[PDB]
A paper describes a structure:
Pseudouridylation is the most common RNA modification and is observed within tRNA, rRNA, ncRNA and mRNAs. Alternatively, an RNA recognition mechanism that does not rely on guide RNA factors is employed by stand-alone PUS enzymes that independently recognize and modify their targets. More recent data have suggested that [name] is the predominant PUS to modify uridines in [name]. The structures illustrate how [name] recognizes and binds a helical RNA duplex and enable the identification of RNA-contacting amino acid residues that make extensive contacts with each RNA strand to orient and guide the RNA into the active site of the enzyme.
To further examine the interactions of bound RNA with a catalytically competent version of the enzyme (in which the catalytic aspartate at position 134 was restored) we altered the RNA ligand by substituting a 5-fluoro-uracil (5-FU) base at position number 1, reasoning that it might be captured in a suicide complex by the enzyme after being flipped into the active site and subsequent nucleophilic attack by the carboxylate of D134. RNAs harboring such substitutions have previously been demonstrated to act as mechanism-based inhibitors of pseudouridine synthase enzymes and have been used to demonstrate the structural mechanism by which the target base gains access to the enzyme’s active site. Although the space group and corresponding lattice packing arrangement of the protein-RNA enzyme complex was completely unrelated to the packing of the C2 space group of the PUS1D134A:RNA complex, the same RNA duplex, and the same position of two independently bound protein subunits was observed. The RNA duplex and second bound protein molecule is again generated by the application of crystallographic two-fold rotation symmetry on the contents of the asymmetric unit (which again corresponds to a single protein subunit and a single RNA chain). Structural superposition of an RNA-bound monomer or dimer from the two crystal structures produced rmsd values of 0.63 Å and 1.47 Å, respectively. Beyond providing an independent confirmation of the binding of two copies of the enzyme to an RNA duplex in a symmetric arrangement, the resulting electron density map, after several initial rounds of rebuilding and refinement, displayed a significant feature of positive difference density in the active site that might be indicative of low occupancy (ultimately estimated at less than 10% in refinement) by the 5’ 5FU nucleobase of the RNA. However, the combination of lower resolution and mixture of density features surrounding that base prevented us from unambiguously modeling the bound RNA in a state corresponding to a trapped catalytic complex.
Residue numbers in the entry:
A (entry chain A), B (entry chain A): 72 to 119, 127 to 219, 223 to 253, 267 to 463, 484 to 493
RNA sequence: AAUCGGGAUUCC
RNA sequence: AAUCGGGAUUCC
């Protein structure tokens, strides 16, 4: 059998793996793919290549690309690779490429998707360091939050009807059980929340303010203003209408992002900054100042909701001849990709939000901390 | 089938797991054991217990204890659990216990074992921040290192005979390949090393200075002097004679430690401090001052060499009646445990040292850093 | 991606 | 045990 270069389109669930890039001994998506290539009979041995995107730990992807030389001679090869692969990783197709094709260089654009529970937009709890800081803004009258005021007031109403004035604001048998029941009560109060139209409008205003070509040095752990890479371009960004899904009936929103290229954890930093602005009520224009002088520390959002929709290859497509090599279009798989998304990615995100408590953790930590200086009605 | 409380003795390889304690969704030794209990038919469902030691991520254990109620009615049950378990986790035996038995409380003592490559004792490289600091000690004449002087001089001799004055002390095709070949040369020079008797004597002197009852606040990430837990007692500690094992013919030493109880990463902090004292040549008595006033930051050693030999249960053994319940003695399995050690733990440590480059990483990082103030011939 | 020094949260 | 703010190393 001869060697033949080829490109493999793949989809996977990022949960339970240490990223896309091969990095032993920790199990990675590439490691599992390689293990499935020798079980189907397309790889030789020893060692060896490129990839469209290097998705971080836990990040899923409806679409990703690898490029390698394999024995593409068996008519039923992709079926064998899929039978030798776990249910959470699928190979959509195997299309041939040329020697000039570079997976990292010829990546024109990228489509990402972030699932976000709507209760992430509720303001901080009374008694938190961020609330008292926003309260300390009672000098310069900023924004006022009447929505989260009624939410936390209703939670305090429910707590006094379920507890009997237990000073359970202290921890380190039944007191453990009391505090756990209290935390479960807060989590259920968050999961019962239904977002308004004004909060969604503010969130979409910030997301729209992300659009265009800007310096994104404050949305990455990297060099500052006078760096080349910091300038990047967002082509499209859309926050979907909220929807309720799951047994717990949590409410979610889907943020679809279209970009040229991306920095380290740029998407998560952007989504976190948007949620932080929407939460306290800081002026939406304060996001533009994040492009400005003073460097700020914004923590990136949980990687659980991050999902790489698809990489685009406009440059390689146009430069392709009329006959001989097919174009790289991910829209030609939308049926199987949508089914796999719904089954293995989306449902896993819902279950892991309900159990692993990722998004509750993230914002219970934001209130106890650097980034407060930006959203403190003064910077 | 009725419920029956029991204690399971277990052994495992820590590589590829996130610790002993059950912590989903990350795969743990307890998670794999539970998955193997329902595949053999000893657990019901839903959820649920104690454990002798909570071994950190990557740490292996020739012996560990769990306690749970299971259906111990099938005569060939342990064989089924072992057939339903990966090769890297074994159940040695399943002996019954009483309701009073507490795995964490009645743990009398613990035997740990650390495998350490001898090249960890070689002093810092010329041009490192720690060398120049030890060089800055050319005022107060401390210790002088003639052993590592000839080692690094011989490496510089070999580099000039293999390279042609390439200023490859700069990085960020072939220059990458040049630097990689240079680093492989340094690693091979370390692996060819054979420890002397004086260095081993100094290492054993420090290890012996660990013995007795002392305040170990500087050997844990925790509270300082005026804390209760900091006082702990070491009963026995022995560094074995060096031995050469493996295809790469690396030289190792085995440090066996016997203690009452242990703090967070106490063993690794102790081993790292011993190696740090032996390396630069700081006075062995400086380890005693680590029990003293000034708090110091000592980084814990790689968890790869750490191996929990066995927990002891002297209190539960003596308080046991003459008939009815068997004593918890781990020495009754030494054959199978030694075979499993040699095959799955020790060989894995050797392979992971050669490949994953753990111990080379650790000490190449010590030279570039807080802890230098202790071993700088002045504190 | 992994390790380590500290600071913080969630599950333990 | 996991996440995050920075500082450092190893493999990339």
């Amino acid at each position: 059998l001869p060697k033949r270069k080829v490109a493999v389109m793949v989809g996977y669930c990022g949960t339970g793996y240490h990223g896309m890039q091969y990095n032993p001994p920790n199990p990675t998506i590439e490691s599992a793919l390689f293990k499935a290539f020798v079980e189907a009979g397309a790889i030789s041995k020893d060692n060896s290549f490129m990839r469209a995107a290097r998705t971080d730990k836990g990040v899923h992807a409806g679409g990703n690309l690898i490029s390698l030389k394999m024995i593409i001679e068996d008519p039923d090869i992709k079926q064998k690779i899929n039978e030798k692969l776990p249910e959470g990783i699928r190979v959509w197709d195997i299309e041939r490429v040329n020697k000039a094709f570079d997976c990292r260089k010829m990546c024109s654009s990228r489509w990402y998707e972030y699932l976000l529970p709507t209760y992430s937009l509720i303001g901080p709890k009374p008694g938190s360091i961020l609330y008292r800081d926003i309260e300390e803004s009672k000098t310069e009258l900023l924004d006022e939050d009447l929505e989260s005021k009624e939410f936390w007031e209703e939670f305090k109403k429910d707590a006094n009807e379920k507890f009997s004035t237990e000073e359970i604001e202290a921890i380190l048998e039944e007191l453990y059980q009391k505090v756990k029941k209290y935390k479960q009560l807060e989590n259920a109060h968050r999961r019962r929340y239904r977002i308004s139209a004004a909060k969604l409008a503010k969130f979409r205003a910030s997301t729209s303010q992300y659009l265009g070509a800007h310096n994104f040095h404050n949305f990455t752990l990297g060099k500052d203003f006078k760096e080349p890479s910091a300038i990047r371009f967002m082509k499209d960004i859309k926050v979907s209408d909220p929807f309720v899904i799951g047994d717990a009936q949590t409410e979610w929103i889907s943020i679809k992002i279209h970009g040229q290229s991306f920095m380290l954890h740029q998407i998560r930093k952007m989504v976190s900054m948007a949620t932080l602005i929407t939460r306290c009520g800081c002026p939406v224009e304060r996001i533009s100042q994040a492009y400005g002088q003073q460097k700020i520390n914004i923590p990136k959002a949980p990687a659980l909701g991050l999902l790489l929709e698809a990489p685009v290859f406009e440059g390689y497509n146009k430069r392709l001849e009329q006959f001989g090599y097919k174009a790289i279009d991910f829209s030609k798989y939308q049926d199987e990709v949508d089914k796999f998304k719904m089954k293995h990615i989306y449902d896993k995100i819902y279950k892991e939000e309900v159990d692993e408590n990722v998004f509750n953790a993230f914002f219970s930590y934001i209130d106890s901390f650097k980034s407060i200086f930006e959203f403190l009605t003064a910077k």
